[PDB]
Design a protein around this ligand. Sequence first.
Ligand code: SF4
Ligand code: SF4
Ligand code: FES
Ligand code: FES
Lengths: 633, 633
Amino acid sequence: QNLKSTDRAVQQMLDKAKREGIQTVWDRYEAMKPQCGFGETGLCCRHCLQGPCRINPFGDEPKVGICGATAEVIVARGLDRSIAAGAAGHSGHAKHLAHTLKKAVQGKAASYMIKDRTKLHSIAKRLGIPTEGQKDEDIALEVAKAALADFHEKDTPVLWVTTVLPPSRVKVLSAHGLIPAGIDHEIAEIMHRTSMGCDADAQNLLLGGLRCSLADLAGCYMGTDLADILFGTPAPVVTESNLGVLKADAVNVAVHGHNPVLSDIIVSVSKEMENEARAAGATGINVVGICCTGNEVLMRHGIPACTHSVSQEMAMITGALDAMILDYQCIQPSVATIAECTGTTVITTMEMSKITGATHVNFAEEAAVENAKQILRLAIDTFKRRKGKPVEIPNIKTKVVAGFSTEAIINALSKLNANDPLKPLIDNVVNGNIRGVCLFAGCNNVKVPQDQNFTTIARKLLKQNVLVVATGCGAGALMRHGFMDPANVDELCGDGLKAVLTAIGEANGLGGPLPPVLHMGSCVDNSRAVALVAALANRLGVDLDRLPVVASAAEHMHEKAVAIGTWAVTIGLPTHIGVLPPITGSLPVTQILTSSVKDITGGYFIVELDPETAADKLLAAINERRAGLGLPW
Amino acid sequence: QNLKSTDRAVQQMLDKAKREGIQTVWDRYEAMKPQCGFGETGLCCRHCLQGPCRINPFGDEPKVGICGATAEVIVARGLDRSIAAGAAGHSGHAKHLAHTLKKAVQGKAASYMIKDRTKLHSIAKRLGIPTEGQKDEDIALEVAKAALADFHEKDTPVLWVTTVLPPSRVKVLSAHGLIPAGIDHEIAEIMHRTSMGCDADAQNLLLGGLRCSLADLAGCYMGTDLADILFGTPAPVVTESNLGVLKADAVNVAVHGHNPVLSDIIVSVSKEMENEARAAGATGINVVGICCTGNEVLMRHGIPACTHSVSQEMAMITGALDAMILDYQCIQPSVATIAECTGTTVITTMEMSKITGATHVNFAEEAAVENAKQILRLAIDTFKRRKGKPVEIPNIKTKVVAGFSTEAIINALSKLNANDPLKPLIDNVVNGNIRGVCLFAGCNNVKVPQDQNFTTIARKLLKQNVLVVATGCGAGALMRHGFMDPANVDELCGDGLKAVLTAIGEANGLGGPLPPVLHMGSCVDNSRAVALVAALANRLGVDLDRLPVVASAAEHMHEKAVAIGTWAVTIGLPTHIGVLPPITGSLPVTQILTSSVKDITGGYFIVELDPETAADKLLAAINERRAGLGLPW
Ligand code: SF4
Ligand code: SF4
Ligand code: FES
Ligand code: FES
C-alpha cells in the first residue's frame, strides 16, 4: 500500500477497504491502465463533431487534425481550456462570497457579518474606495460591488489583478496585453478562441492562456479577501491532522469542498448543538476538515484536518464518519457510492454540484443556521445508527501549527522590527540564513505515491535553508507528515533557517520556533503568498522575477491547479510541476512554456517528475535569482 | 468525388486538388480513420491530470472514471462544455457588435452608424428603454449598454431571453430554473460545474446545459439585433452562389468567418477602389462570401456566395482567389497552408483569431476604412502576381433569392392582410396548404457527403407542403443546389405550398412565387426564426411546443451548432440532428435528450443519421403537433 500512499493512516485504511471489497481511487486507476497516450501527450481534439481527431506523436498518419489543426494548435487549445475551467472554479467561489457579503450588509442574511473590519478598510483603500465618514456596511457594499464588477468588461481592467501586483509587474503584463478585462469575459474568450476554426497560432493561444490565468489569480485573491472580511483573517493556531482526529464516541462530521460559506456556519452551529448530540449518546459534534474547506476552518478556527485530496475516501472507510458535508470542487463522486457500505450520510448543498445517490440539502445564506441544523441532525441520526458497531480509526495524527496569513507573518516579523517588518526577512535572505522562498501548492494525484513528491522536495529545500510555505493539499501533505510541528525544526531545517524560525518564534513569546513549513491556507489562499512576495518585491524595489522565490505544484491534478501554475509563471516565478500536463505532444508548446516565456514574464515552468531532481532544479532556480541580485549562494 | 460532396463544383475542384497533390479536409478525414470510439461515444474524460479516463461502452474494465465519474456524468459534462463553447462563440460575436455600436454613437468610429432607425426603436421598446423625446444616439447608447449588461449578473435576468420568447414559454423555463442570469456567467458556471469533483448528477448537469443554451440563444438574438441596427435589416435580394461566381478577370476577394463588422466595410470600400483595381488590369474587385460572414453580406447586399463550410478550401483550389479575409469561427486553419500552393493571400483581422503563416492586419473599428484599403491592396497585389496564369473556375452557379428577415416575411405576408399579416400564414397552416415549418440550420460535416442530408430531407418536406426556412450552411447547402431559385418551385414544392408561395409572391408584385426555401440568414440569424415562430405562437395564443414547427441540424459539426440544437429543444421544438454527438455511451443521457426532456420543455432531440428516415420522423413530429391542435394531417 506504500506504492499508493506514503501516509501510514491511509495505508491502514487501504488494507481495510481491500479486505471488505470496497473499490478505491487507486483500484479505479489500476483498472484504467494503460491510459490513452494521445490524451496523455495532448494530441487529441474533440472540439467539433468531425472529431475525435488524434495525432501520432511519432511516425505516420494521422499527422494533423481534420480541419488542419496542427499538433501545436491542438495542445495549446486544450491547455487553454484547462486554464479557463480552473479560472471558472476559483472565480465561482469568489463570486459566491461576493454575493454573500452583499446579502449580509443589505440585511438579508443575519448569519453573516463583517467580522474583519480592518481587512475591509484595507481592501477598500487598495481599490480606491473611500472610507472616511462612511458606514462599514456601505464600504462593504462598495467592495462587494467592485468584486462583482471585475467579472465583466468595464472602464477599468480587473482590479483584483492591477491593484495586487507591483506596478512594474503590471506594466510588463500590460505591454504584452496580458491584463484581464473581466474574469468571466476572459473565460468566455478562451472558450471562443479555442473552438473550431478560430485561433490557430500557438503563441497567440498561449498568450490568451496567460491572461486567463491572471483572471484565475484575481478570483483567488478576491476569494481570500472576501472570506477574511466575512469570517476573519487567520492568525496562528494549533490543531491536529490525519485520520486519528476522528473520535469513535462523537458525531464525526467532515466539511469537504472549497467554499466555507456554509462550513464556517457548521462550525459555529455544531457547538450550539452539543447537548442535542449528547442526548444521542455522543460526546458531542466532532467537526473535521477534508480538502480546502477543511483548510479554511483549520486556518480560522483550528478545526483538525482529517485527510485530503486523493485519500478522501479513506475517512469513510474508518466506519466512524457520520456525515460528509459537500459544497463543490475536488469531491470524488465515488463517495456517494462508498457511503452505501460505510454508513456515512453524504450531503450536497450547492445547486450546481449534486451527486447521484447523495442527499441534497438546499443551502441558502438567508437560512444558513436552519440549514446547518437540518444537516447536523441527519449526522446525529447516523451516529445513532452505528451505536454498537466497531470502527477502525487509525491511531495516527500529527500536531499542526497553522494560521499564517500574510498579515500574521508580517505581524510575527514586526516583533523583530516594528516599523519595517519585512526587513528582518530580507536581511536573512541577504546574509544567506534564508536561501529563498518556495511555495508548495496544488493537489495530490493518483499517478504519484501520495505525498512523496511534496515531502521529498520539502526535506531537501529545508536542509538548504529555504523558507517553505504551503497551501491546499500541498499544505495537507506536509501537515500530515509532521512538517507543521515545531518539534521537528531540529530534524528538518538547516542551521540558518532554524536560526530565523527560532528568532521569530521566540520574539512572539513562543519559547520555541515557528513550524518548519508555514501553512498559508486554502487553494485560493495562494493569493496570500502573492501578497507576501509582492510586499517583498515592493520593499526591495524589484519585480517578482528578480526575487529568489519559486513555486512547486509537486503532485497536481485539477484544472484549478493548472491555472495556478500558469499564473505563477505569468507573475514571474520559476514554477515546478511534478505531473506532466498534456503538452509533450508539441515541442514548440513545451519550449514556450519551459523556455521562451522567460522573455515575456520572467517566470517559466520546470517540468520534473523525479522529486530529488526537482529539488535540485528548484534550488538551482533560487540560486540563479540570488546571483542576479549579486548575493552569495 | 461524389462520396465526398454532392456539389458538382466541389467535385471538380477535388479532382484538381488530387492531381496537384494538395491535401484536403476529406484527405485528412481519411487519414484519421478509424476514429477513436471512446471519443465518438463520449466515454472519455480529460478534465484532470489523473486522466485521461475512458469507459468501455460494453464489456469489462474500465467501467468508471478514476475519480468515480460514471458514464452518464462523463457524457453530460462533455456535452455541457460543448454548449458553453458554442455560447462563447455566438456571444463573443454579439459582444463585439455591442462595443462597435457603443463606439459609433460615442463618435469614436465614423465608419459605423445607426443605419436601421426603425429596428433600433423597436428593440428599445422590447427592452423597455424609453424612446419618447430621446436622441437616437442616446437610445442606441442605452441599447448597447443593455446588451453588455446581459453578459453578467444584475437585477434582471438575460433580457435577450426573457423579452424575445412568449410569456408562457418564459414561465415554463423559470419554473425549472432555466432562465440564464448572465451570458458569460452561465458559460463560466458550466466550466466550473463540469470540472473535476463538482456536479456529478446527469439530470442536474443537463439542466445547466439547457440554461447555457439559452445564453447562446441570447447571444444569437443580440448579434442579429445589433447587426441590423448597424448595417440594415435584410430585405429580399437576388444574387448567385457556388464557385462560378468567381471571375478570372477580377480581383476575387472572399470574406470568411462570422462577424461582418469588417466585411460590411470591405463591401462598401471595395466599390470605392474599383479604379485602383482597374489600373492593376482587373475589371474591378469581386467580393464573394464564404460561411456566415458571406451570408451576412449576401443578406444585406446581395454579395454572391462562393462556398461554405467543409468545402471552403475549394475556392482557393481554383487558382483565382486573390484574398481570403478572415475574422473568426469555422475557418479551417489548413487554408494558411494551402495558400502557399494556390497563391491566395490569407488575412486574419481579429486579435484572438490568428493562423500561423497567414498575414495579420490589425483591424480597429476606429480605422476600419484605412484597414480595408490596406487589405484590398494586398489583394490587388496578389491579382497582379497571377497575371498570365490559367485558372480553373467551375462554370457552375445557381440563382439565389434571399434576404428573408422576419420583418421582410411579415411585410410580404402583409400584402395579403395588412392589419393581421400573420393570419394568412396561419390560415394556410390550418387548411393544410402549409403542413408545418422546418428550419434547417448548422454546418456541413466531413462525415456526411456534403449537402446530402439537407437536400434529401428538404426535397421530401417540400413535397409534403412544409414551409422550409434555412440559415448558415444549411442555407448554403440549399442555395448551392437551387432551392432558393423560384424557377424550381414547380419541380420541388407540393401543390398546397406552391399555391401559398405563389399567392405571396404575386401580391409582392413579383409575377412569380417566393423561392422554395426562405433564406433567413447567418447562424446568429437563427434568432430570426425564433422571432417568427414566437410571433406565430403569440398570434395563436399557444406556446412553441404546440406549434407544427421543427428544426433540423442535418449535418452539424461546430460547438455553436450543438448549442443551437440544444436551445431549439429548450424553447420547445422537435430538433433533428443528422450527426451523432458524443452521447451514445450513456443510455440515461440519450433517454433524457430524446425522450424525457419532452416533460420539461416540450421539445426533444430526434437522432437520425439516415436522411430519408429523418424526413419521415420530422413529418411525423409536425403531424403530431397538427393533431394536438385538432387539425387534419
Ligand atoms: S476542431 Fe479540428 S482537430 Fe478538433 S475535432 Fe474538429 S476537425 Fe478535429
Ligand atoms: S475528472 Fe475524473 S473521469 Fe475526468 S480525467 Fe479526472 S479522474 Fe478521470
Ligand atoms: S484518443 Fe484518447 S484522449 Fe482522445
Ligand atoms: S480515448 Fe480517444 S477521445 Fe479519449
